[PDB]
């Protein structure tokens, strides 16, 4: 599943921001507009026992250039909330459900 980092109109959003997937399916987060961006899973809002570091950028890490990507596949079922660190308050957040 491809997820744009920044919408095509410049909005500071993941597109899509809420979506499902099945275990092992690639998520490719791609810098689109308004970069730098990053993808951080919220360590308090992911499934029991999941290591957020295995699936996240750190908050200090950035994707700098247009078209740069961060790929992650999730395994464990349940809800995972994530955000872009520098743009979280602007509303650049999302939630993926592994089902
Ligand atoms: Cu961002």
Task: Return the structure tokens found at 60.
Answer: 């200090």
Q: How many C-beta atoms lie closer than 10 Å to residue 81's C-beta?
A: 16
Q: What's the rounded Cα separation, in Å, for the pair 88 and 80?
A: 15
In DSSP notation, 34-90 reads S--B--EE-TTSS-TT--GGGT---SS--B-STT-EEEEE--S-EEEEEE-GGGTTT
Q: Which of 15, 6, 4 is nearest to 33 (CA)?
A: 6
Residue 84 annotated to the active site: yes
Residues of the domain holding 37? 1-99
Experimental method: X-ray
Residue with tokens 């699936």: 55
Sign of CA dihedral 30, 54, 17, 13: negative
Q: Report the DSSP pairing between strands 78-83 and 69-73.
A: unpaired
CATH code, domain carrying 78: 2.60.40.420
Residue 57 annotated to the active site: no
Would you say 90 is a known binding-site residue?
no
Q: Which residues contact 96 (CB under 8 A, 6 or more apart)?
A: 18, 19, 20, 21, 27, 74, 79, 80, 82
Q: What's the rounded Cα separation, in Å, for the pair 37 and 26?
A: 19
Q: Look at the chain and report how many structural domains it folds into.
A: 1
Residue with tokens 């275990």: 23
Distance 23 CA to ligand 1 centre (A): 25
Would you say 84 is a known binding-site residue?
yes
Q: What is the resolution of this structure in A?
A: 1.0
- Residue of 3, 12, 92, 98 marked active site: 92
Distance 9 CA to ligand 1 centre (A): 14
């Amino acid at each position: 599943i491809d997820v744009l980092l920044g919408a095509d109109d410049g909005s500071l959003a993941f597109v899509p921001s809420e979506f499902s997937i099945s275990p092992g399916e690639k998520i490719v987060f791609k810098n689109n507009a308004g970069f730098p961006h990053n993808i951080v899973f919220d360590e308090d809002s992911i499934p029991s026992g999941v290591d957020a570091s295995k699936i996240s950028m750190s908050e200090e890490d950035l994707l700098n250039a247009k078209g740069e990507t961060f790929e992650v596949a999730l395994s464990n079922k349940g809800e995972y909330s994530f955000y872009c660190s520098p743009h979280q308050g602007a509303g650049m957040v999302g939630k993926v459900t592994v089902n």
